Motif scaffolding. Sequence first.
Motif, PDB file in Angstrom:
ATOM      1  N   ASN A   1      27.507 -10.723 -44.025  1.00 47.52           N
ATOM      2  CA  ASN A   1      27.337 -10.632 -42.576  1.00 47.52           C
ATOM      3  C   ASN A   1      28.610 -10.113 -41.906  1.00 47.52           C
ATOM      4  N   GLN A   2      29.314  -9.218 -42.596  1.00 51.16           N
ATOM      5  CA  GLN A   2      30.505  -8.568 -42.065  1.00 51.16           C
ATOM      6  C   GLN A   2      30.452  -7.085 -42.401  1.00 51.16           C
TER       7      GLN A   2
ATOM      8  N   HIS B   1      23.732  -7.326 -45.479  1.00 49.65           N
ATOM      9  CA  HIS B   1      22.752  -8.354 -45.176  1.00 49.65           C
ATOM     10  C   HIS B   1      21.906  -8.646 -46.410  1.00 49.65           C
ATOM     11  N   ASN B   2      21.712  -9.930 -46.691  1.00 41.16           N
ATOM     12  CA  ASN B   2      20.909 -10.316 -47.852  1.00 41.16           C
ATOM     13  C   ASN B   2      19.438 -10.474 -47.485  1.00 41.16           C
ATOM     14  N   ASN B   3      18.895  -9.449 -46.834  1.00 39.75           N
ATOM     15  CA  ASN B   3      17.501  -9.467 -46.411  1.00 39.75           C
ATOM     16  C   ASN B   3      16.607  -9.183 -47.605  1.00 39.75           C
ATOM     17  N   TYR B   4      16.578 -10.120 -48.549  1.00 36.72           N
ATOM     18  CA  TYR B   4      15.855  -9.941 -49.806  1.00 36.72           C
ATOM     19  C   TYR B   4      14.357  -9.830 -49.517  1.00 36.72           C
TER      20      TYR B   4
ATOM     21  N   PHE C   1      18.331  -7.991 -57.737  1.00 31.98           N
ATOM     22  CA  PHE C   1      19.659  -7.399 -57.757  1.00 31.98           C
ATOM     23  C   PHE C   1      20.618  -8.267 -58.576  1.00 31.98           C
TER      24      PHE C   1
ATOM     25  N   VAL D   1      24.488 -10.073 -59.564  1.00 29.49           N
ATOM     26  CA  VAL D   1      25.245 -11.192 -58.999  1.00 29.49           C
ATOM     27  C   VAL D   1      25.517 -11.023 -57.508  1.00 29.49           C
TER      28      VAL D   1
ATOM     29  N   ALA E   1      24.109 -10.610 -54.977  1.00 28.94           N
ATOM     30  CA  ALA E   1      22.724 -10.643 -54.523  1.00 28.94           C
ATOM     31  C   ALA E   1      22.637 -10.350 -53.032  1.00 28.94           C
TER      32      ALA E   1
ATOM     33  N   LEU F   1      35.185 -17.112 -40.295  1.00 30.61           N
ATOM     34  CA  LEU F   1      35.080 -16.264 -41.478  1.00 30.61           C
ATOM     35  C   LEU F   1      34.778 -17.077 -42.728  1.00 30.61           C
TER      36      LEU F   1
ATOM     37  N   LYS G   1      33.122 -19.378 -45.279  1.00 31.77           N
ATOM     38  CA  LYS G   1      31.747 -19.802 -45.511  1.00 31.77           C
ATOM     39  C   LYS G   1      31.668 -21.113 -46.281  1.00 31.77           C
TER      40      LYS G   1
ATOM     41  N   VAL H   1      21.439 -14.732 -60.294  1.00 31.28           N
ATOM     42  CA  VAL H   1      21.295 -15.294 -58.959  1.00 31.28           C
ATOM     43  C   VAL H   1      20.186 -14.541 -58.245  1.00 31.28           C
TER      44      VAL H   1
ATOM     45  N   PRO I   1      18.393 -14.456 -54.425  1.00 31.18           N
ATOM     46  CA  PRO I   1      18.575 -14.941 -53.041  1.00 31.18           C
ATOM     47  C   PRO I   1      17.272 -15.288 -52.317  1.00 31.18           C
ATOM     48  N   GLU I   2      16.596 -16.320 -52.810  1.00 30.78           N
ATOM     49  CA  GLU I   2      15.417 -16.829 -52.124  1.00 30.78           C
ATOM     50  C   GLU I   2      15.817 -17.619 -50.881  1.00 30.78           C
TER      51      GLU I   2
ATOM     52  N   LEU J   1      14.551 -13.134 -39.821  1.00 28.54           N
ATOM     53  CA  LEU J   1      15.347 -14.023 -40.651  1.00 28.54           C
ATOM     54  C   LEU J   1      16.704 -14.263 -40.009  1.00 28.54           C
TER      55      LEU J   1
ATOM     56  N   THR K   1      19.775 -14.345 -40.441  1.00 28.58           N
ATOM     57  CA  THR K   1      20.875 -13.969 -41.317  1.00 28.58           C
ATOM     58  C   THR K   1      22.221 -14.378 -40.741  1.00 28.58           C
ATOM     59  N   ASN K   2      22.303 -14.587 -39.425  1.00 26.41           N
ATOM     60  CA  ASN K   2      23.534 -15.083 -38.828  1.00 26.41           C
ATOM     61  C   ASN K   2      23.775 -16.556 -39.133  1.00 26.41           C
TER      62      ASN K   2
ATOM     63  N   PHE L   1      23.460 -19.287 -47.158  1.00 22.67           N
ATOM     64  CA  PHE L   1      23.374 -18.390 -48.300  1.00 22.67           C
ATOM     65  C   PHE L   1      24.742 -17.900 -48.756  1.00 22.67           C
TER      66      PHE L   1
END
Lengths: 235, 189
Positions: free
Chosen positions: A1-2, A70-73, A83, A85, A87, B89, B91, B130, B132-133, B176, B178-179, B183
Amino acid sequence: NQLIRTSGVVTSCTGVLPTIYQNYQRIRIQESPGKVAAGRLPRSKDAILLADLVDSCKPGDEIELTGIYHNNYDGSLNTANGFPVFATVILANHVAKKEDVKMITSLSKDQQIGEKIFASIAPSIYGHEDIKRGLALALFGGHKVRGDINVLLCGDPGTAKSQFLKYIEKVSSRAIFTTGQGASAVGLTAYVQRHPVSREWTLEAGALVLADRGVCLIDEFDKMNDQDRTSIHEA
Amino acid sequence: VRDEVAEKCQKLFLDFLEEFQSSDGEIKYLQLAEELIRPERNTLVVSFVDLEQFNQQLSTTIQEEFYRVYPYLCRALKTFVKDRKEIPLAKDFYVAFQDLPTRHKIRELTSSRIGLLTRISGQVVRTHPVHPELVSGTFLCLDCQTVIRDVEQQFKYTQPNICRNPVCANRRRFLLDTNKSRFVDFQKV
């Protein structure tokens, strides 16, 4: 997200390949170059073209990639592959379209070092006089002004003579070891596998493409499979 | 009642993150910051033996309530930076411990004891990449309702059905958060 600044090279285009899946295509992208520090294997990038940069990308563009990861899987429906690692779904946003070098360069023209240079070329094992000639030619690598070099060695694998080519990667910028069958991903040879109902056929990106105007090193050439020979003979 | 204990456990954790031994001052803090941030390895250690000597009831409280102390160690513990610029920054954190002299037999580690401590001992089998669900998050609109620290956690959706303007879910949507999400990275072995 950066927002992320990075670099990359377009390798191939998918015009030659044949409705949810049709909106996008698949491309093979690497980021880590050949280096001694880069010896540990990195995480390969897989980018997705959403029908925007198709046919507009040409090989050989040393371009910079910038964007946000973005991890918009989209595979939440669990009907595809995934994908590595890192991810995250990687979107494309930047593709261009159209010093110690100087200090060393001063020493390069100098003839004092130009005399002992060919008497230190092979210090590891001192080898044979013919091999050094082939190595020196390979180091320089030299319209339709092209050419190929076939350097031959006559030993046995048990002796490190077979492993003598391993020392080249210290000097070479692009060296990948194939070992024959079951090399890393695509070993310069194109192959076809049976895919499920909804997945993308693979466009085989060899190290041949990744070293455009570069040098590619191949090890254990005669141990490759008979099937691979047929495809590679024409190319 | 619960507020005072939740505050004091965090206090007795934070004040102990800096040792009295190993000389004194703030040179050690600078050295640990250099050893952490510069390579970004995120490796830290604190002696559990000394923590137990200081307050053995702390070792019992964590032992019986890992499931309760994980979410407070996740959020409140991050206050060690004392800089507002570095908090958004960041996480997640990383801490560890080595040469632990207290352990339990796996045969005594019965399934009937969920929430205690266990030692990762055995054979690595069945590696997994991994994936990402969707794990945790929220889509609630700020103009409609304010954020409460009780939602989702697992794959389940919102239970309440109040102010049914966006609540009607008989239509596909892909918004979603995402912000705001949990995850970072995760795998099963």
